Amino acid sequence: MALSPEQLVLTLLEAEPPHVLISRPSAPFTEASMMMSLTKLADKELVHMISWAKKIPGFVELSLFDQVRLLESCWMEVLMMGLMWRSIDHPGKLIFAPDLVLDRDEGKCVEGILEIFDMLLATTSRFRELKLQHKEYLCVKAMILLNSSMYPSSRKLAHLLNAVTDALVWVIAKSGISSQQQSMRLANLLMLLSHVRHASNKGMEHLLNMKCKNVVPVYDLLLEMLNAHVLR
Amino acid sequence: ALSPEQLVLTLLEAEPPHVLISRPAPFTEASMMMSLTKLADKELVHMISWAKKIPGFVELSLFDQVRLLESCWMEVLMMGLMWRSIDHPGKLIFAPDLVLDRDEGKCVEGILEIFDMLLATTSRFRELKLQHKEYLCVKAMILLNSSMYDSSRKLAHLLNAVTDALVWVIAKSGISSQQQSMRLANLLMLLSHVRHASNKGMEHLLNMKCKNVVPVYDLLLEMLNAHVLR
Ligand SMILES: C[C@]12CC[C@@H]3c4ccc(O)cc4CC[C@H]3[C@@H]1CC[C@@H]2O
Ligand SMILES: C[C@]12CC[C@@H]3c4ccc(O)cc4CC[C@H]3[C@@H]1CC[C@@H]2O
């Protein structure tokens, strides 16, 4: 009942994290400062991602190992999915934050992010061509959280993933297009999940290179967030 | 235009032949990495012929063909491994004369992680009871969906054709309309898991190159340089 399509979307809509306000530094972007304004923004969003995930129906009913498994495997993917939704209507730019809008070429000051920036902009453009809705994005983001763990309590997670899947089918069904067009959109939407995951792995492979070059302190930003923040 | 009933039949005849490695002496870190990279090299030769037999692939520009192959070749090798191993838990059937149990990875540093990813994704396909026709569509979809960025419009048509074929395959099973969307969604979500395995299994091959366990990293490029045209 709480997993009902119309209801689950409303729950997902009310679980959306608040906008994080980070601004540009006064000095021009250097490799150290840009890699710092991005990991600072990521740290703040990861605080809200825990509250968002805990607010998806059934997530708190999962085991503690499964919750950590899902978050550890999806946090970078969820950060990128939210970035592409904020940049969906601004071609050539990445809307990390309202007061932090980065043009593409601005990534020329840090080694190797332009490859990652082009991946994000390309996937964002494909979501623009598909005319991604707001409720498709809410389902897709929740699906990323529930599906990104590989597991290389199990019955409850499978039920939630199917529930969010029913919600995405229900949102597409509201478009009124043909049954064949409804399957095509569902397939075009989910085939992009591979491109988001690819960006998740590549943009994260780049973050490991920055820790080895002593540009950033640590690599696992979720682990860093949890270690530094305190429980109320 | 090919019907979905006719496209699936074309993918069937495009299936590569089986390859043997026959080897070796117990397994070392270098000997196992030698056998797996040597197996991939032999398979990559047949992957070129397989891709060119997918309807419309030869009509794509030469740039597009190389772009798709460079992006998906590890995924295609891994998807083919998963299909061969779908009915044998705990085992990876790389080639006929090379069936590895899960624990046999311990000899190569970091390979157990990749093996468990391949086995777990293989288990999801087994629990889904992946059909032959579904496998043929999915593997073709991996080639045509791997790229990120007149020939571009033709590629979107080919991916639509293979996707329609998959939807047709699911529809002909006679399951509920809600079950048809559920099955299509579960299949395509596993594409992300194939990509994660491809990215991590390739991150691992790069570490084996810096460790000087294997000579080359881009096995597709090494194949095209060494093999000659007829
Ligand atoms: C992970 C990186 C820093 C954090 C960046 C970020 C930071 C916040 C956010 O909401 C999204 C993204 C996506 C791109 C990420 C970058 C890609 C490479 C870089 O290391
Ligand atoms: C890419 C690796 C070598 C080649 C292996 C292979 C080789 C042939 C094949 O058909 C499939 C696979 C998947 C696993 C691959 C391995 C995973 C890690 C290792 O580097």
Numbering used by the authors:
A (entry chain B): 261 to 412, 422 to 501
B (entry chain A): 262 to 285, 287 to 411, 421 to 501
Show me the paper's own sentences about this structure.
There are two subtypes of ER, ERα and ERβ, which are encoded by different genes in separate chromosomes. Allosteric modulation through LBD conformational dynamics is a crucial process for the ligand-dependent transcriptional regulation since this domain is responsible for the primary cascade of events, including hormone recognition, receptor dimerization and structural rearrangement of AF-2 that modulate corepressors and coactivators binding. While agonist binding induces the packing of H12 against H3 and H5 creating the hydrophobic binding surface for coactivator binding and leading to concomitant corepressor release, antagonists prevent the repositioning of H12 into the active conformation and, consequently, coactivator recruitment.
In this study, we present a new crystal structure of human ERβ LBD bound to E2, where the C-terminal H12 is packed towards the receptor in an alternative conformation that closely resembles that of ER (and other NRs) LBDs bound to antagonist ligands. The ERβ LBD-E2 crystallographic structure that we determined displays the classical three-layered α-helical sandwich fold, resembling the known ERs LBD structures, except for AF-2 region. The C-terminal H12 lays over H3, H5 and H11 covering part of the LBP via its hydrophobic side, as shown in Fig. 1. However, H12 is oriented in opposite direction to the one usually seen in all active agonist-bound structures of ER LBDs. In addition to the hydrophobic contacts, the main molecular interaction that seems to be responsible for directing the alternative positioning of H12 is the polar interaction between D303 in H3 and H498 in H12. Thus, despite the different orientation, the alternative H12 conformation seals the highly hydrophobic LBP in a similar manner to the canonical conformation. In fact, E2 is completely buried in the LBD and its position, as well as the interactions involved in its recognition, are absolutely consistent with the previous data from the canonical ERβ LBD-E2 structure. In the present structure, the 150° rotation of H12 relative to the canonical active conformation takes the E493 residue completely out of its optimal position for the recognition of the coactivators LXXLL motif. The main crystallization condition difference, which led to the alternative and canonical ERβ LBD-E2 structures is that the alternative structure was obtained in the absence of the coactivator LXXLL peptide.
